[PDB]
Amino acid sequence: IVGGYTCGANTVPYQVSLNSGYHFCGGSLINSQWVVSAAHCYKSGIQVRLGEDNINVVEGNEQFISASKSIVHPSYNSNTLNNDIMLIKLKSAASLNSRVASISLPTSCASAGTQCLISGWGNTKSSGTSYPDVLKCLKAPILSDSSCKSAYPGQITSNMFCAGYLEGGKDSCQGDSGGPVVCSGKLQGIVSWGSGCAQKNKPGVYTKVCNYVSWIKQTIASN
Ligand SMILES: N=C(N)c1ccc2[nH]c(Cc3nc4ccccc4[nH]3)nc2c1
Ligand SMILES: [Ca+2]
Ligand SMILES: [Mg+2]
Ligand SMILES: [Zn+2]
């Protein structure tokens, strides 16, 4: 996250860190047994870490649970990143408490202008590499589809939306990938892609979760 701030320990209780020997992507806990992340974060051998703040220090509120199965969206296109969403089932149910809670799925899609909270342990430099150990947060509004499409001609589908600042300076970045974009108490986006990080007229692009609610509900109920 570039131009963001330290969230504070466990202030984003539905945020998960996907670990395969090191942190490589974020995710969102949707109920005690399932996590939603981005399909471009797919790997074999994932351990989900809940209740984290500093990912390099066991502070006491963590739960490390391995994944039993991963399901990448049936129509995910790795070349365009269209349908960039994946579901991960935990081997054991997590214990939900104040530090570990699930986030709600949306009943409708959000309007441009709505302010959201994006979080992650991804890179914090636009020009450089500085990876933080504690969770970073960023409040950003959803941008109109017009400004999103003008920035990326022929690359935005109806399953994506842009959020951010056209002036540059504030954005999510690699490592934040798969993480949550919460607006009005609902998970509305998943950190997906962008052009570099925090560049002018290159806002972040997010998977539009409101278009996948039936798929998510149907898939978790049958697995
Ligand atoms: N500017 C953005 N809003 C942005 C978000 C996410 C992202 N993701 C990548 C590529 C990317 N994602 C990953 C995940 C894990 C290892 C490497 C890696 N590279 N660029 C970006 C850019
Ligand atoms: Ca920790
Ligand atoms: Mg994240
Ligand atoms: Zn990524």
Instruction: Tell me the CATH number at 60.
Output: 2.40.10.10
Q: Which domain holds residue 188?
A: 1-12+103-210
Residue labelled with tokens 């699930």: 102
Q: In whole angstroms, give the CA distance from residue 53 to residue 195.
A: 27
Q: In whole angstroms, give the CA distance from residue 81 to residue 205.
A: 10
Pair (63, 162) in one structural domain: no
Pair (17, 98) in one structural domain: yes
Pair (201, 134) in one structural domain: yes
Atom of ligand 1 nearest to the CA of 164: 3
For residue 147, give the nearest of 134, 163, 136, 135 by alpha carbon.
163
Pair (1, 30) in one structural domain: no
Residues near 187 by beta carbon (within 8 Å), at least 6 away in sequence:
14, 28, 30, 36, 103, 104, 105, 106, 180, 181, 209
Pair (35, 86) in one structural domain: yes
Beta strands in the chain (DSSP E): 5-6, 15-19, 23-31, 34-37, 47-50, 63-72, 86-90, 115-120, 136-141, 160-163, 180-183, 186-193, 204-208
Q: b/e for 139-177, b at 16 or more Cβ within 10 A? A: ebbbbeeeebeebbeeebeebbbbbbbeebebbbbbbbb
Identity of residue 185: G
Pair (124, 165) in one structural domain: yes
Q: In whole angstroms, give the CA distance from residue 161 to residue 142.
A: 7
Q: How many domains does the chain have?
A: 2
Pair (51, 120) in one structural domain: no
Pair (62, 85) in one structural domain: yes
Q: In whole angstroms, give the CA distance from residue 92 to residue 200.
A: 43
Pair (154, 184) in one structural domain: yes
Tell me: is residue 174 an annotated ligand-binding position. Answer: yes
Ligand 1 pocket: which of 143, 172, 177 to mutate (most atoms within 8 A of CB) = 177
Any idea which residues carry the catalytic annotation? Answer: 40, 84, 177
Cβ pair 138, 1 in contact under 8 A:
yes
Q: Give the dihedral of Cα atoms 105, 102, 171, 79; nearest 10 deg.
A: -60
Helix, strand or coil for residue 217?
A: helix
Pair (20, 36) in one structural domain: yes
Pair (96, 112) in one structural domain: no
Pair (90, 142) in one structural domain: no
92 exposed, middle or buried (CB, 10 Å; 0-12, 13-18, 19+)? exposed
- Ligand 4 centroid to residue 173 C-alpha, Å: 7
